[PDB]
Amino acid sequence: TRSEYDRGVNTFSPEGRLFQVEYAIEAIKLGSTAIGIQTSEGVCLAVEKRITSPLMEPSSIEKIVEIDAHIGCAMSGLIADAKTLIDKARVETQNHWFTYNETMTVESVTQAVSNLALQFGEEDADPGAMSRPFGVALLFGGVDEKGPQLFHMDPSGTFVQCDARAIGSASEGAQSSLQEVYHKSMTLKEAIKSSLIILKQVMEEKLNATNIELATVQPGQNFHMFTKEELEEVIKDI
Amino acid sequence: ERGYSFSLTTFSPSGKLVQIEYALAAVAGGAPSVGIKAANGVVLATEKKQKSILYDERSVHKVEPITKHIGLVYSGMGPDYRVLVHRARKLAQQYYLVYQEPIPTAQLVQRVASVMQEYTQSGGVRPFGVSLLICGWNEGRPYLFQSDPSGAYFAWKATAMGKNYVNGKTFLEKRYNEDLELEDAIHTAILTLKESFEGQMTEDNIEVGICNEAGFRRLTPTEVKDYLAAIA
Amino acid sequence: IGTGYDLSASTFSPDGRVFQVEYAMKAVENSSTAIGIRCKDGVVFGVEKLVLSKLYEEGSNKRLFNVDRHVGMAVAGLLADARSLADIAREEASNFRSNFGYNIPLKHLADRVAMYVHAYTLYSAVRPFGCSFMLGSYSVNDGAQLYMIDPSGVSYGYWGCAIGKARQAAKTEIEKLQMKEMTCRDIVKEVAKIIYIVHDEVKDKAFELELSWVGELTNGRHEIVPKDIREEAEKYAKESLK
Amino acid sequence: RSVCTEAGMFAIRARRKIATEKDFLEAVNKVIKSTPRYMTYN
Amino acid sequence: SYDRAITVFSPDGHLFQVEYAQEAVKKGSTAVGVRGRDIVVLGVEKKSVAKLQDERTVRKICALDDNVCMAFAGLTADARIVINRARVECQSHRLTVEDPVTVEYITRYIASLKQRYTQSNGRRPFGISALIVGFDFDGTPRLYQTDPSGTYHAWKANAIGRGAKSVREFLEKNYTDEAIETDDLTIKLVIKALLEVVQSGGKNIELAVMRRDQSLKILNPEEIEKYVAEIEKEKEENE
Amino acid sequence: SAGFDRHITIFSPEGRLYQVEYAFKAINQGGLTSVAVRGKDCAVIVTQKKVPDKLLDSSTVTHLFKITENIGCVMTGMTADSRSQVQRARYEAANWKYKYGYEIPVDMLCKRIADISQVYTQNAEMRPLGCCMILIGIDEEQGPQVYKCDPAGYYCGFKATAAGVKQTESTSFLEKKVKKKFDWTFEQTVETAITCLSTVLSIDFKPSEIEVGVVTVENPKFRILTEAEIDAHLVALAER
Amino acid sequence: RYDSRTTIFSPEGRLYQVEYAMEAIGHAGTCLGILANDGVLLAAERRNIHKLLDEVFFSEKIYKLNEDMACSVAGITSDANVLTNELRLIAQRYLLQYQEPIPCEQLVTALCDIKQAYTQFGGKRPFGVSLLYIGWDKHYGFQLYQSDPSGNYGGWKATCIGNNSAAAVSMLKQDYKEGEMTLKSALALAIKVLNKTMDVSKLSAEKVEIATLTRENGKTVIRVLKQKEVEQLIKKHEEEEAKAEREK
Amino acid sequence: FRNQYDNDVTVWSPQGRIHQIEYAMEAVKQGSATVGLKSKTHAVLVALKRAQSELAAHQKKILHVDNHIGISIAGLTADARLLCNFMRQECLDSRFVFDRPLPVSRLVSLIGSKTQIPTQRYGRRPYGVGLLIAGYDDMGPHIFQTCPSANYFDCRAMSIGARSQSARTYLERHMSEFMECNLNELVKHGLRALRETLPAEQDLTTKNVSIGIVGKDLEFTIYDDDDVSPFLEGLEERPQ
Amino acid sequence: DLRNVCTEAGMFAIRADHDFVVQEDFMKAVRKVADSKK
Amino acid sequence: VDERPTEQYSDIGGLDKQIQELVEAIVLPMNHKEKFENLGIQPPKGVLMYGPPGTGKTLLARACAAQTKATFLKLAGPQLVQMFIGDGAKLVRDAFALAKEKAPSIIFIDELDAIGDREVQRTMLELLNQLDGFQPNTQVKVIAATNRVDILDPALLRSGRLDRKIEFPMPNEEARARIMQIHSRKMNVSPDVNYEELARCTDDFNGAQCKAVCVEAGMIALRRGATELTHEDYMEGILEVQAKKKANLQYYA
Ligand SMILES: Nc1ncnc2c1ncn2[C@@H]1O[C@H](COP(=O)(O)OP(=O)(O)O)[C@@H](O)[C@H]1O
């Protein structure tokens, strides 16, 4: 009888598992696949658009968003929950830039975002906050003093440094592929080719301009989201 | 229908709140009380019968004055009636303080009905299990009102709630006349108590209070005994 | 069995009893045994502390707190509940000192802490403190008192009492002991031997004995039994238990 | 196995001797599941 | 179970209360909005008043500000509340920054308000869907759709309410670049989309049009018959 | 029919609050019994004492307390609830003394504590303090008063009252005594109370199992009957 | 099921507590209002006059809110009183803030916003009260609005709410000549509606509660029909009915 | 269901247990293993890093809260991180107001007081995190194990997490030496315990282990794959 | 409970192997029965 | 019936006091019923035990049935709560009735049972008024094992019905060792193993858990490649037991 421990986040199972947090974890599997890879030359983020209607404006679907010029984001989960998470991430980045007048590292960014998360079971929610776990998984990538850096954020608030992490409806298959196709000194161009290969292999529909949003961050340039023509150039090779 | 008889903030699919009706049922199980509006004044009566004559009847009173001209009587719980008395006294004194004028009984009934209904707003607090009878005299006119646990308030020429309220109401509608006099009003109220009193009302077994142009006064036991002897 | 009425501490039973308090009673009864005895010029305390693993340091989970400089603290039940109760009692004693300017009488401190633990009994959003604790003190102008306060919130004065799984056994074994005459010296040995007999070796073994006292022998100050007195008490326990 | 059978039937429906991936997609859309997941999740 | 709790995830990771609130929009009335090169239009299906209801206060299309309009579907009272809050926020934003509110900002505010109304117990989600239309002060045609879940999306021509799927397919099959070349072509498109579901024509149809910053006038009941007459003339022209 | 006995704030059909009666039974759950009797100018309260073992300090197991210097109190039921109730009563009495500048009458003190209990029984945020209360005292122009308060918030004046497990039988015996219409001098009030307890328990108690408190007009201070005086009273009764 | 606190959504999307608040109005007394060319009126049924009600009152169902405002109530008495007090409060607040009598639309929207807030959130039972606001303004002359426990409202020229409200409104719409009714014709129509909708062969003036709002000489006057006036009106209608039946 | 007594920490089982507290206790058995040892003048924290996948970095289990006191977490990440922030704030407050390090005993006492509140009152879920606490103060090193039941133990060593019983038995067996070790010997015993809880097919690699050491003159420093290389260079081979 | 007291006294009689009962036997029997009652 | 239960008290271990009580409560009065009627009192018509699940309550019942060669009936406790209204004087009476002709007999109640909610009331009314209507010579006895002491009916826990009460405690440490030993005498286990260490590693383990320990230890002794003569297998078995599945659960630090 798991049902009594199902209701509510403040209930411990006989196995000690947080079942509602587990359900928030599984709610990621309803989001479109997002793939991020860590390379010495930078980090690339590739996502699946899952366009409902050809009439929809593609720019509205924000799988990849800019937290700061030096950092990038990729998302998989509830759009609303993410939007709040992204706004908090940007606000905290600007708070760091105000107080310390420096570009805050992506590890500290994911630390602060996780601080906003994992707060569902807290009494500080009296003014108003989330009484349920956030149901969106975050893929943070960027460049900092430690070179390029990629971090994946767990809806429970856990973050880990991942050389190549895939989140979304197809986390298992894309992660299994990245397990054997990833290599440490892999160049940024071949990394982006590998990411697009995995996305093509795992996508439900065929690969085109409107099925993927691509982002890249390298130590030289700032956050760059691949425009249409750049997408065509990178997708003709594959 | 059972799942909707447990909360005060959920509507039954067919009708309305059931906890209000259950509080009204608690009211109906209380000590019988009657109130009669005469031409010149108003009288209200209730029975103080309780076992164990050890009980000091003078200690508590079921008929209390709100101000110099307003009196009230309940039929139901005692402690809820006491709380209602305190609240009504507070409202009357607040009205007096702001307007520097004795509070008209109609406004008092509206305010006390609002007070009782404010306990029916939300769950976790129960409605008062007490129905009030408000007697008053102002503007050359005697007033008689009944306040409900639901917050509904209405006027009454002559009514009787509590235990055996239906027979009391039938007797009153068979006896009450608009041209009644105060003394005959008290006689009718005492007889209405008597017909279901079960135990030969004494001077202290019943408690009555009268209100007229000379304000509201709870009758002393001597006058109650005199009226009982006159009725016999 | 009281099903349907024991889910909260603000709901009575058809018999008219709050079952949450009785379950806290049972929790205390399923815990270690601690005893205390009030001598002519002070009180002494004894605890059967079970070392659950040899890995724990000696003195781990100190069960004999000191609420005030002159007030003892012997507890049984849940160690976390006991620590919270000791902390709130310390806060109460500090507030009494700050407001009234003198040491809190043991009867008044017991009354206040019992009031608090009762206040944690009659709500529904909180749970009764599942631990029974002892209170002991010695004042030159007041005397020596001993108080046992259980999760029920009751605070009775005991000549010398015990709490734990060996409640009744320690009651019988302490009854034959005559109590009112001697001082701490001729009562620490008795406390040690009573604790050593009530403890069962075949099941629930590996326990260590710790004692504390307050009195004029330590200038009305609660403190642990000194090492020399502790070891001579242990030797008396060994020779008496044969 | 029912999904594979339905993919075969879908291929038969278009009178094609070879079943395509689209036929398997439609078969799994029919058997499995016997806007809500596309407008709030993404 | 997992359905009667707003902030409880189902085992398959669904907030079923939010989805039920979303589905409550489908029980409303059809409302389609199309944006063109210089015009944005709001076509809704107007319920036929029986004999006594005043159409003046059955407002389905309401203007949040001089540069934004919106049509809702799903719950009149919740709609009224969100409309009042949206205009209050538009005025407050113009107070804070002195420039007129862009369609994106007001849409984001509405979505955030509905979201914050669907993140705690004791707060029923706003069971309406909104079609935000208008022009930014730079003069760009933007249309937005807000979901009861608290999310928003950019649509070139979307439909909400009952039968919104059929109107969606109609727009998919009929939204072309040349179909919005002139204002009359956009009007023809939106009227055809409406008649796809409300086939009677004439009445049961309300249109509001927005050209470049003119303080939109809803098409009064004197040219809607004229516009549907032109639609029928074209309809017999091509067939 | 049933199932409405779970929440204090829930009205059952036929308008019956079960939880209040459940608290009333929790009063008897204490296992003790007390009686109070009032004379022309005296008021005596006496309660039974049960001591499981000599291990307890008999001086701290008292069941009757002192609210103010001239108002006494005795209670039965859950003893922790009783101590909380006397603490609240002392608070209320001193606060009344502060606010109005004169000693709290017994009737008003009982009224206010019953109002507190009613507020507890009206909202579902409390357990309604399942312990009975009996107060005694002297008021000018009225004489002695004996007042009883219950968890329901009901308070009344009593010429003679009781509480505990033997409520009904003690009340019947007190009825039999009161219907004889006798003056009830101080010694005879104490005698009648002790006889009530003895007959209702059929124990013929030793003098060490009872505590007595009396208030008289000549001694308005609530005096707790010490061991010597209770010994005198009850041994004289035994011989008388 | 999904019949718990009002802040719940049925899978089909229905707000069942709000629906029950809707259907609860059918238990209330029947009240109707009709819009005439040069006046408006509110006709209400006194469902509870047993033998001994003092009738110390101006109107139970009809409640005056402002020198230009009047409305009839239909629902639980407590929610009725609370809503009427809030109506007076908001009307006087608007008068204080703007130094102008509050428009009917604005006041009705304020009350309906309050009612929606009572079903939008908080775990509070919605006001089971339906209202019929009567008033005049410079903006739209004479207006009639019918409220709703759900927090909705509508502008009507003829509307009946209470028991047998469906049949009453059906026959009313069958027998309403818009734009060509004076106060007298509206009164006769209201009397006929109350006759056909109440469970009495010959309804008495006591069971009928009628208040008329009319703007004349710069100011709007709200008056309830006196006992003699309402008796004359009902007797005129019964002789009209007698003439109709003898002619047939 | 007879297990309706495990839904919140505010209900007792009829056997006198808080089943939800026990579930919180067992929750930390789901975390990875971690052991700690202490010498005369040095306390060590060695934890078994776990990775979600071999393609991502290992989860950090040793957290630095102050120069003299450091902790190791084993349980839910959220509660462990919240407790870490609370300890950091408490230590900073101590350094600000008293200019002295918080004694480890006082810090663990405050930890227990803080995590007892969820145990007692409805609302916050009990902190389901087992913590190994190691620091320095006047009376030398200490290692403290904070159980999720708001109970803590002063221990010479302890192992919390998955398959911790084997490590506990290893420490019981080698008890007689821990006190008299230097840095290398105690680190070696800790690594052997972590190898004991590790299964046969796995071994303590540089990425799999993390070391935290505090001492009299050496501040609490966390060691990683390159930093644990010298500590593993002297390691003996697994006794397989 | 009283018949239980008697039967338990009879049972106590054969724990110490008597063919009869004693007064202390009745005391300990009623003690055990009272504890079972609690 | 399972008439041959094949026990000799060498199967039950760590319950010496318990089996002594069982013997003195059932079979000692059975053979000295004469000394009972000399006292003028009736023999105990039914024993009772209680304890955590898997502590050997059924094994001791089977052992008593073996040493007394008495017919065994394994009446279930949770099964009887269902089967509609009728599992009172239709199955319980059926269980008792025809057992009395092949009557060296010991009928056996098992896991506690509930000792809307009216069917269990009827079940226990049938129990009390059928067990109380017992046999004079008491040639058939009842043993009424349960699982907890929380729920007790005084009408059953009184004299006659269920007065003889035996507590089954959790095996402490050496009882754990004894259980391990007993469940490992049929495997060719070398003296190289150390049962005492396994016993001190069996904290919280209760009875049948140790049997599962032995079984799993043998299973992996096969898994190691049929490597007989091993104690490391006992160690790993102590680690896995019921918790053999290893969660691999994320969001745990
Ligand atoms: N002391 C013991 N010695 C040997 N085996 C035991 C012991 N206790 C329990 N067992 C094992 O546990 C099982 C019996 O469990 P038991 O407690 O009788 O069942 P239940 O709890 O379902 O009534 C048997 O397989 C038996 O071998």
Numbering used by the authors:
A (entry chain K): 4 to 241
B (entry chain H): 3 to 234
C (entry chain M): 3 to 244
D (entry chain A): 386 to 419, 426 to 433
E (entry chain J): 2 to 240
F (entry chain G): 6 to 245
G (entry chain I): 4 to 251
H (entry chain L): 2 to 241
Quote what the paper states about this structure.
The 26S proteasome unfolds and degrades hundreds of proteins to maintain proteostasis, regulate cellular processes and generate peptides with second messenger functions. It consists of a 20S core particle (CP) capped by one or two 19S regulatory particles (RPs) that gate access to the CP proteolytic chamber. The redox-active thioredoxin (TRX)-like protein TXNL1 is expressed in many cell types and was proposed as a nearly stoichiometric component of the human 26S proteasome. It uses its C-terminal PITH (proteasome-interacting TRX) domain for binding, while potentially reducing disulfide bonds with its N-terminal TRX domain but how it binds and is regulated remained unclear.
